[PDB]
Structure formats: structure tokens, C-alpha cells
Swiss-Prot record:
Domain of life: Eukaryota
Disorder: Spondylometaphyseal dysplasia, Pagnamenta type: A form of spondylometaphyseal dysplasia, a group of short stature disorders distinguished by abnormalities in the vertebrae and the metaphyses of the tubular bones. SMDP is an autosomal recessive form characterized by short stature and mild platyspondyly with no disproportion between the limbs. Mild metaphyseal changes are present. Acromesomelic dysplasia 4: A form of acromesomelic dysplasia, a skeletal disorder characterized by short stature, very short limbs and hand/foot malformations. The severity of limb abnormalities increases from proximal to distal with profoundly affected hands and feet showing brachydactyly and/or rudimentary fingers (knob-like fingers). AMD4 radiographic hallmarks include mild to moderate platyspondyly, moderate brachydactyly, iliac flaring, and metaphyseal alterations of the long bones that progressively increase with age. AMD4 inheritance is autosomal recessive.
Binding site for 3',5'-cyclic GMP 1: 83-86, 93-94
Region of interest called cGMP-binding, high affinity, as start-end residue ranges on this chain: 19-119
Lineage: Eukaryota, Metazoa, Chordata, Craniata, Vertebrata
Species name: Homo sapiens
Protein localization: Apical cell membrane
Record family assignment: Belongs to the protein kinase superfamily. AGC Ser/Thr protein kinase family. cGMP subfamily.
Disulfide bridge partners, by residue number: none
Protein name: cGMP-dependent protein kinase 2
Residues that coordinate or bind 3',5'-cyclic AMP: 83-86, 93-94
Subunit structure: Interacts with GRIA1/GLUR1.
Length: 119
């Protein structure tokens, strides 16, 4: 699915996330190899506040904004991990994440994220 170049970009994105610094390099490597590409059209939501957390994402291309309601929280820089809170802490999505342009993410599903933690 990915060359060494993309694997390195995703790896760095995951390693920079404060809540993921706990994981071993083997766990990160496993996440990377398992991640799958998903595109989103402009104006669609990658994440909706209040939903369960079924995926963790890395922004690979395009622009994303984080919202509570109509209120803007943050612009997600390229190669940033997001959607991790609801996964790690068994909570609901804390905010919505909207596609400001057409977007590509790398995504990992929740159960896999935990199978990897079960290795
Ligand atoms: N203030 C904020 N700034 C940047 N990102 C945020 C902020 N609040 C929430 N997020 C991100 O938005 C995501 C929405 O779903 P999660 O709660 O799973 O994980 C959340 C974080 O990755
Ligand atoms: Ca990150
Ligand atoms: Co979906
Ligand atoms: Co580009
Ligand atoms: Co762009």
C-alpha cells in the first residue's frame, strides 16, 4: 500500500502525537503497515462531535478544520494525527473535523488499533 517514503511520513506523524509517545516502535510500525487510504470531498466531515470513535487518522493531503458547532477550534497541519482521543479513552468524539478542501487521510480502525495493542 505504501512506499518507504510514505511509511516514514506516517511514522513521524504518529510519533509526534503526545498521547501516542507511550507506544513502542514495533507498535507504531504495525499501525503504519495496517493503515489504509481514505479520501474525503470538500465540505464533508471526517469526524462528528458526539459520535463513538471508530478510527484514528493522519492528515496526508488537503486542509482540515476542527469545530465545536459553528465555533472554529483549530486548523490541522499536514501529517498530524487526529481522532485519537475517542479511541484511547473510550469516549465520544470531542469535536467535529471538516474537510476544507478535498482531503486524503491514512486511517486505522479501532479494533485493529486494539489488536495491535494485544500483540
Ligand atoms: N482544541 C483542539 N485542537 C486541535 N485538535 C483538537 C482539539 N479538540 C479536539 N481535537 C481533535 O479532534 C478530534 C475529534 O475526535 P477525537 O475526540 O477522537 O480526537 C479529537 C482531536 O484529535
Ligand atoms: Ca501528530
Ligand atoms: Co465511516
Ligand atoms: Co499536495
Ligand atoms: Co493541500
Amino acid at each position: 500500500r505504501k512506499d518507504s517514503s510514505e511509511k516514514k511520513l506516517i511514522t513521524d506523524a504518529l510519533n509526534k502525537n503526545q498521547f501516542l509517545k507511550r507506544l513502542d516502535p514495533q507498535q507504531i510500525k504495525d499501525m503504519v503497515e495496517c493503515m489504509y487510504g481514505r479520501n474525503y470531498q470538500q465540505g464533508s466531515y471526517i469526524i462528528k462531535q458526539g459520535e463513538p470513535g471508530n478510527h484514528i487518522f493522519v492528515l496526508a493531503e488537503g486542509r482540515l478544520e476542527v469545530f465545536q458547532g459553528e465555533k472554529l477550534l483549530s486548523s490541522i497541519p499536514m501529517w498530524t494525527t487526529f481522532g485519537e482521543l475517542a479511541i484511547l479513552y473510550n469516549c465520544t468524539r470531542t469535536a467535529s473535523v471538516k474537510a476544507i478542501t478535498n482531503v486524503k487521510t491514512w486511517a486505522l480502525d479501532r479494533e485493529v488499533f486494539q489488536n495491535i495493542m494485544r500483540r
